[PDB]
């Protein structure tokens, strides 16, 4: 416990399902600048401040970044006790936040805006930790590859990051279909294993 109560007017507040994360805010016109030097984490909507677990090297200078949320919608049917009581309840439930460096600390307005996907930092709700991602650039072009034809694909619960060229992206149906095929195949085999003739059979 820090033992001092901070002024939160000077801190960015990011809210996750189980925690609130505070990072320092240097003044700027569009509110995009971040200091990773001071950070605190708090139980949800309560005000006893505490120091986060930092699992990686953190930046020592001001960085312009963009924030995104990762999570799952929860739709529940709640009990009905009055005539017009709500039939359904929906909650966002964010679990991780990804902060990505603007390129060369450039600003949105500039014609030259892009995002540096090499530097992405993650905040995790369950572990109260901040870490840096490991990206695998499979895009030829080297370190100098253009940043106007780059796309990042995140898979695996936020644990896999890759940069690939734009045109080689998969359509939305293919991603769903690929997954269903894998699961369905494994499940049929599990069923059919019990039969005494499995060793002598062929998938077709």
């Amino acid at each position: 416990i820090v033992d001092y109560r901070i002024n939160e007017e000077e801190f960015h507040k990011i809210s996750l399902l189980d925690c609130d994360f505070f990072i320092r805010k240097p003044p700027d016109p569009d509110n995009d600048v971040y200091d990773f030097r001071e950070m605190y984490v708090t139980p949800p909507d309560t005000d006893i401040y505490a120091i986060p677990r930092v699992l990686a090297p953190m930046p020592q200078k001001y960085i312009r970044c963009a924030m995104s949320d990762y999570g799952c919608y929860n739709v529940t049917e709640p009990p009905i006790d009055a005539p017009r009581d709500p039939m359904y309840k929906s909650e966002r439930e964010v679990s991780k936040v990804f902060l990505t460096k603007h390129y060369r600390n450039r600003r949105a307005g500039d014609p030259e805006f892009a995002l540096d996907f090499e530097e992405i930092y993650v905040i995790d709700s369950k572990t109260k930790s901040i870490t840096r991602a490991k990206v695998v650039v499979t895009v030829p072009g080297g370190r100098n590859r253009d940043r106007k034809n780059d796309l990042l694909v995140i898979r695996d619960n936020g644990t896999s990051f890759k940069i690939i060229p734009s045109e080689e992206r998969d359509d939305p149906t293919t991603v769903i279909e690929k997954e269903e095929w894998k699961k369905s195949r494994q499940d049929m085999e599990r069923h059919l294993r019990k039969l005494r003739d499995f060793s002598v059979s062929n998938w077709f």
């Binding site: 090499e118 840096r132 991602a133 490991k134 990206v135 695998v136 650039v137 080297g142």
Partner: peptide, 8 residues
């Protein structure tokens, strides 16, 4: 140059 963080 490159950290463990970025791999090509």
């Amino acid at each position: 140059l490159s950290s463990e963080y970025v791999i090509y």
